[PDB]
């Protein structure tokens, strides 16, 4: 898997004490970034050719909480990829221990249209 | 429906200029508070007796984007209701048209345990 | 004073227990929009006009905290209007108590460049 | 100063295109997060002796923006250190260049009273 590690951060809780169920997929959104930097493919660079990559559906199942200051990973794996979408998995882990389990699809946009995934883009993806 | 009418704060939009795929969890969440809150039992009288409504899973699919200052209404259902669990519906609409869809599925907590839900809160909930 | 009423969200909430100091400046941010509103000129119109209000500073002075479902009110006064600028001030009450008070100053843009504040946002203002 | 480098996530943007304001005070609080945990003595530690470091004023100059993937540091300052308070100072800096100055100041407190600033707390601030 592509790995991301992540500390929490004081403000990512709420007053139960665990953070917000919202900020995972703010997690998951800075892992799909960092496996695009890494690969050298940012997605700033893709929205400077005028490309948007946008989100169909987001999906997360909660098994244990995450507190403040704990260290987590989330591991990232390329589901689907098709003409014109593609599908991430993610599992947040703690310690020994996956404490969340989620999915995100996406598509993209250019002038306002859907259009089918560039070449380059597969590449990185792939 | 329960109706939850809102409109699209500035901070919650992101650089593509739609409201950030995030918020839309913590609009579901003012959502269901309000629901309690119209009902005469609100979430902070559960934190009181010591009760917690945890989360377990979250889903949401996204058909058109909010744009900052657009008035929208999330529309509430009672999906399914157990000894332990509930399971809300929502529909976010803007104008004629559905925006977005998700649901929420949440159990309940006394004492580091997991309780079956209060004759009191299923009262409210039904 | 122009008075803006909000219940405190709980995602708004950190594991502190209380509004994290952060969120008070959306607060603001929300009070600015009502207030333009009120008047009939808002934001978003001045947005379709190729403005942008631009902020230059803010500063927020925190006396008593704000709790989750907290129901509490902003008074925003106008400080300060010049050629170029705006200040306003806010005080946060919570029953009767002054809970937080801040400041923020702005300017307003025009493809890239400052521009003197339009005679029709002016009289918004005053 | 102590050096905290990061990057702008997408999420952290609004529709202007640019960091919401907001987000800065979440900056800092990760910078001074950082330079607890540099010393060996992070808050979460200080939490687990029932201490709380609780904000009193925050105030931020904004000089020029921050956009989506921007790196950039907060150059951190102990600016004031007393019995009971102490005060932090930051500047951002993006490349070269000053983009934002600001100050924050802040107190401590046990058993929902404020106490002196523990000994060993004074000796990783100074």
Redo the contacts between chains.
């Keep these: 898997p592509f790995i991301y590690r992540r500390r929490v951060?004081?403000?990512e809780?709420?007053?139960?004490?665990?953070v917000?169920?919202?900020?995972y997929?703010?997690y998951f959104?800075?892992a799909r970034?960092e496996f695009l930097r890494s690969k050298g493919f940012?997605?700033?660079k893709m929205?400077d050719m005028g490309l948007?990559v946008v989100?169909?559906?987001?999906?997360?199942?909660?098994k244990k909480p995450l507190?403040?200051?704990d260290v987590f990973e989330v591991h990232l794996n390329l589901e689907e990829l098709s003409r014109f979408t593609f599908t991430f998995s993610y599992i947040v882990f703690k310690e020994d221990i996956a404490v969340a389990k989620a999915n995100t699809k996406h598509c993209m946009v250019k002038n306002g249209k859907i259009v089918s995934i560039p070449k380059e883009v597969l590449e990185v993806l792939k």
Excluded: M, V
């Design positions: 951060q004081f403000y809780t709420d007053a139960q004490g665990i917000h169920h919202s900020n997929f703010r959104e800075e970034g940012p997605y700033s929205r948007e989100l169909l559906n987001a999906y997360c199942e909660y507190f403040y200051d």
